[PDB]
Amino acid sequence: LYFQGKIEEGKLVIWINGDKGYNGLAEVGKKFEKDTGIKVTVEHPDKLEEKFPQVAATGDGPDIIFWAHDRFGGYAQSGLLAEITPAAAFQDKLYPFTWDAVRYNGKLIAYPIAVEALSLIYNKDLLPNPPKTWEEIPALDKELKAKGKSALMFNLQEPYFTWPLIAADGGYAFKYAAGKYDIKDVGVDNAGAKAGLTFLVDLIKNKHMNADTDYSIAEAAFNKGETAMTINGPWAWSNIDTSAVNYGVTVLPTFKGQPSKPFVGVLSAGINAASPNKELAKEFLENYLLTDEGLEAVNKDKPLGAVALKSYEEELAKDPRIAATMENAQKGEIMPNIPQMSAFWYAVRTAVINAASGRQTVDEALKDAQTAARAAADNREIVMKYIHYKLSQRGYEWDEVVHLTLRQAVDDFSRRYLTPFTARGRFATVVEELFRDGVNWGRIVAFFEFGGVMCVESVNREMSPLVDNIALWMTEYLNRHLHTWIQDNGGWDAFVELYGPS
C-alpha cells in the first residue's frame, strides 16, 4: 500500500483552471503565506478536473480544487471532498442558493465562490434598446439585414446555449423538488420544450439564424460588429473588451411571456477529503478569499461574473452587466450535480442538431432525447445494482428482473471463462479489445464481469473511492458507446428474453 505516502504536505496546494484569475488568487495566497508562514502554491494543470478523481482516490492531489459546482457531485459520490459545516454567521454572508449548489446527499462539500449564467450581449451602437422578447427578433433581423447586419448569432451546436429558450415554456431536465431530483421525471419532450425548440428551428428556416453557427462563428461576428446580439457568459467579455465593439449585457429575452431559464454554474472551492491541511484550507477560504478584498483580487485578474458573497456582489452589481448576470441566474436553475446530467446533455445536443438541420422534426428529435435520457438513467442503475451485488458477495458494503438476469449471466460467464492510474489504463485497454469486433450481449456480460472484479480488487487494496471511479467509467462507456447498440437490438428487455427463463 505505497499509495498512502504523500507529496508536499508542508504547503497549501490549490488547483484552479487556467481560464480563471489564478494570478489574482495567487495574490491572495501570498498574503496568506505572509500572515501564516505556510507556503501557498496555486497551480493550473491542464485537464485538472479529470486528474482530481485519479490523484484524490489515493489520498493525494491538491488540498483545494476550484471548479463549477456540478462536477463536485461526482467527487462527493467517491468520497473525495471533505464535508464542511461552516458557522451560521459565515453561511449568512453568502446567498442561500449558492449553498444549495454545493450540497450533495444533504451535506455541504465545498465553499461557493462565483455565480455565472448566460446573458443577452448587445452592440450598443447597433442596438441601443435590445428586445425584451424572442418574438420580436425576426422583425428586428429584417431591419438589420437591410443594413448588411443581422440581429442575433449565438452557438447553436451546444445545448447549454439553446436550453434557456427550450426551458422557457416548460422544458426541464430532471424534476427538482426541495433539493431532490426525480430521476424518473424528465421534461425533454413536453409541450413547453417542443414550443421553444420549434421557435429556434423557425428562426433558422426563416433565415434569421444559420444551423451551422457555433461558438467561434458567433463570437467573430459579434466582436466584428456584424450582428447586433449574441448570447454568452462572462468568460467571453475580455475578448469584447479589447475589440472596438461597445457592448452591453442584459436580461435574456422572454418567450411566450416567460423568462429564458439558463443553467447556473457556481464556481466552488472543495477541500480534499485526505488533505493534511484541511483547517488551513478552511481558514484560507473563509478568512482570505471570501472577502471583499479577496474576491476583488481574483475578479480584477479575470471576471467572476456575479459572486456568492452578498457584500461584494452588491458592489459588483453597480455595473449593469453584473446585475444582469445575477438576474438571469435567478430566473434560471442551478445546474444539477447528479451523474445523470451527462447523458441528458448528449441526448439534447443530438436533438437540437437534428431538428435544426432538418433531419428530424422537433417532435421526433425530442422524443428520442427523452427516451435516451431516461434509458441512460436506467443504465446507471444497472451498473450500481450489479456492483453493489458483486461487492456484497465478498462481504463489502457499498452505497428488477433485469438486475437478477444480468447478475446470473455474469456468474455463468465467470465459471466458463492496482491503482487508480493503472485501473484507468486497464479499463480502457480491456474495454476496447472486448468490443473491437462489434457489440453483442455476450461482450456486454463480459464487460460487467470485468468491471465487478476490478471493483473487488479496489476494496482489497484499500482504495474504495476507486470503486466509484470504475462505476462511473462503466456508466459512461455504456451510455456513450453501447447505448445505440442496446436500443437498436431490443433494449434490456431483449436481453432478459434471451437470458431469463421463459
Swiss-Prot record:
SUPFAM superfamilies: Periplasmic binding protein-like II (SSF53850). One of its GO terms (cellular component) is outer membrane-bounded periplasmic space. One of its GO terms (molecular function) is carbohydrate transmembrane transporter activity. It holds the Pfam family SBP_bac_1. InterPro entries: Maltose/Cyclodextrin-bd (IPR006060), SBP (IPR006059), SBP_1_CS (IPR006061). Induction: Induced by maltose and the transcriptional regulator MalT. Permanently repressed by cold shock in a PNPase-dependent fashion. Its main location: periplasm. It is found in: Periplasm. Keywords: Periplasm, Signal, Sugar transport, Transport. The keyword Transmembrane helix does not apply. One of its GO terms (biological process) is detection of maltose stimulus. The keyword Signal applies. The complex is composed of two ATP-binding proteins (MalK), two transmembrane proteins (MalG and MalF) and a solute-binding protein (MalE). Belongs to the bacterial solute-binding protein 1 family. Part of the ABC transporter complex MalEFGK involved in maltose/maltodextrin import. Binds maltose and higher maltodextrins such as maltotriose. This is Maltose/maltodextrin-binding periplasmic protein. The lineage of its organism: Bacteria, Pseudomonadati, Pseudomonadota, Gammaproteobacteria, Enterobacterales.
